[PDB]
A paper describes a structure:
These channels are notable for this unusual architecture as well as for exceptionally high F-/Cl-selectivity. A Fluc homologue from an [name] virulence plasmid, nicknamed ‘[name]’, was used for all experiments.
Accordingly, each central Phe was mutated to Met and tested for F- transport. Remarkably, [name] results in an active flux-phenotype and displays clean single-channel recordings with near-WT conductance. We determined crystal structures of both Met mutants to test the prediction above regarding F- coordination. The Met side chains in both take on a twisted conformation, filling approximately the same space as the Phe ring in WT. As predicted, in both Met mutants F- ions are coordinated by the γ-methylenes located in nearly the same positions as the coordinating Phe ring carbons in WT, as though the substituted linear side chains attempt to mimic Phe’s aromatic ring in occupied volume and F--binding electrostatics. Also surprising is the full activity of the [name] substitution. This may be rationalized by the F--coordinating γ-methylene, whose weakly electropositive character recalls the electropositive, edge-on presentation of the Phe ring to its coordinated F- ion. The Met side-chain configuration in the [name] structure is in striking agreement with this idea, but the functional impairment of F83M, which offers a similar configuration, remains puzzling.
Numbering used by the authors:
A (entry chain D), D (entry chain C): 1 to 96
B (entry chain A): 2 to 126
C (entry chain B): 1 to 125
The structure:
């Protein structure tokens, strides 16, 4: 019944080539968050990286100016029933 | 075969109780899942009361003793679920609660065993 | 919930039976740290660790098999309660060195086996 | 299969009114030993006292000189199957 998906994913700060994102942790033991990002225009590779379970913010760098990016965050979390599994993602669009 | 039935009947009741209590309550406080804690504390209590009670009644059927201790307490308690919970916390970088979980499970389970033993020991005259 | 109950009972009964057989066969061989109770906790730690890593890679497995292996088998096989009386008895016997040793070897050992189980499968895939 | 009864019960030292007894511990977790002693002659009352599980010697005091005593030792021990139970006794006769 308890959701393992993060909430309130948003860009807290931005430059033309980078985004500082943050999110609220779900009420489960998160081992790590997986951040993904790629250009919304679906003709460019999606990249992913992890952040530790204690962190609830991340920096994305090396972006192109004036381009729409799709950014998602999901968890690798422990629960009783599923042990280690991956949550569904929370997703936002942001234009540099 | 009679001993095997005691282990299976007791074990099945204990495992079922752990399953029900864990799925119902563990998600309420994930830093120290209370379903897994309560079953370990409860099993510690029961085995302690068994320790003291069976000493005073040496002629009880080995069936009931085996059903309560190896069966019920054995099925009800868990070291394995306790380990993954701690392992996950260690992997999550949550050392304060990994350490707290180890102390509260172990020190707590011994205290409940002591309580169970001494409550029954104090009751006898 | 009836199909889930069968997984818990079947798994639990196999685990409890294995603990019973291994404990009665081996615990008396070294009573300062009963090896039957240690081996089942170490083994359950290993299985739950391998399950942790394996079930992550196979998210579409039936919840039946996952529940039978973890809550059932590992839950029934491992024990916190029998671990507690062994330590309690040693504490009552004035044998503090082995009471402390038993606590460290069971807990540190069970976490190490969980780590081994997890990383062996993680390194394989 | 492992015996919980002590072995080699014997008087290591004596005075007219006391006996220092010793025994080999059985290969089980002994919580306490129970020492019993009474006059071998007839039905004078048998008395008992406990000694801690770590000790494998005990002093018996307040005996009468030149009298035959029956001395027994049994354990209250932990095992896997029986939890806390009492062993059979080991027994010796000794004349002060
Ligand atoms: C006394 C009991 C001993 C029993 C043995 C238990 C062994 C514990 C295994 C720990 O697992 C590691 O824990 C790190 C710390 O949580 C994680 O680092 C993660 O988090 C770090 C910061 O928290 C980052 O620096 C790393 O890059 C990142 O991988 C890492 O992934 C994980 O494999
Ligand atoms: C780790 C967290 C804490 C968990 C809870 C701790 C519970 C421990 C209970 C210990 O029980 C006592 O142990 C003493 C031995 O340790 C025994 O003393 C016996 O043995 C002593 C010598 O070993 C003598 O001095 C005493 O007179 C004699 O009663 C005593 O009877 C017994 O009740
Ligand atoms: C977290 C727990 C909180 C509750 C604690 C309350 C304790 C109340 C009981 C009194 O404490 C001990 O009781 C033992 C008996 O129960 C006595 O052992 C005596 O009797 C034992 C057997 O019953 C022997 O093993 C010992 O050698 C012998 O000293 C021992 O002297 C005494 O100090
Ligand atoms: F374990
Ligand atoms: F835990
Ligand atoms: F327990
Ligand atoms: F132990
Ligand atoms: Na168990």
């Amino acid at each position: 019944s308890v959701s393992s998906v993060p909430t309130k994913l948003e860009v807290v700060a931005a430059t033309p080539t980078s985004l500082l994102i943050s999110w609220d942790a779900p009420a489960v033991t998160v081992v790590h968050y997986v951040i993904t990002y790629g250009e919304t225009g679906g003709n460019s590779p999606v990249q992913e990286f992890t952040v530790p379970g204690s962190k609830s913010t991340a920096t994305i760098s090396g972006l192109k100016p004036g381009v729409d990016y799709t950014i998602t965050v999901y968890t690798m979390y422990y629960s009783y029933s599923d042990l280690y599994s991956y949550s569904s993602p929370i997703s936002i669009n942001y234009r540099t | 075969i009679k001993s095997l039935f005691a282990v299976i009947i007791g074990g099945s009741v204990g495992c079922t109780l752990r399953w029900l209590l864990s799925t119902k309550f563990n998600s309420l406080f994930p830093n120290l899942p209370p379903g897994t804690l309560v079953v370990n504390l409860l099993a510690g209590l029961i085995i302690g009361t068994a320790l003291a009670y069976f000493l005073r009644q040496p002629h009880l059927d080995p069936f009931w003793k085996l059903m309560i201790t190896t069966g019920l307490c054995g099925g009800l308690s868990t070291m394995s679920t306790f380990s993954v919970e701690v392992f996950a916390l260690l992997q999550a970088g949550n050392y304060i609660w990994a350490l707290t979980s180890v102390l509260v499970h172990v020190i707590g389970s011994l205290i409940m065993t002591a309580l169970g033993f001494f409550i029954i020991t104090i009751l006898f005259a």
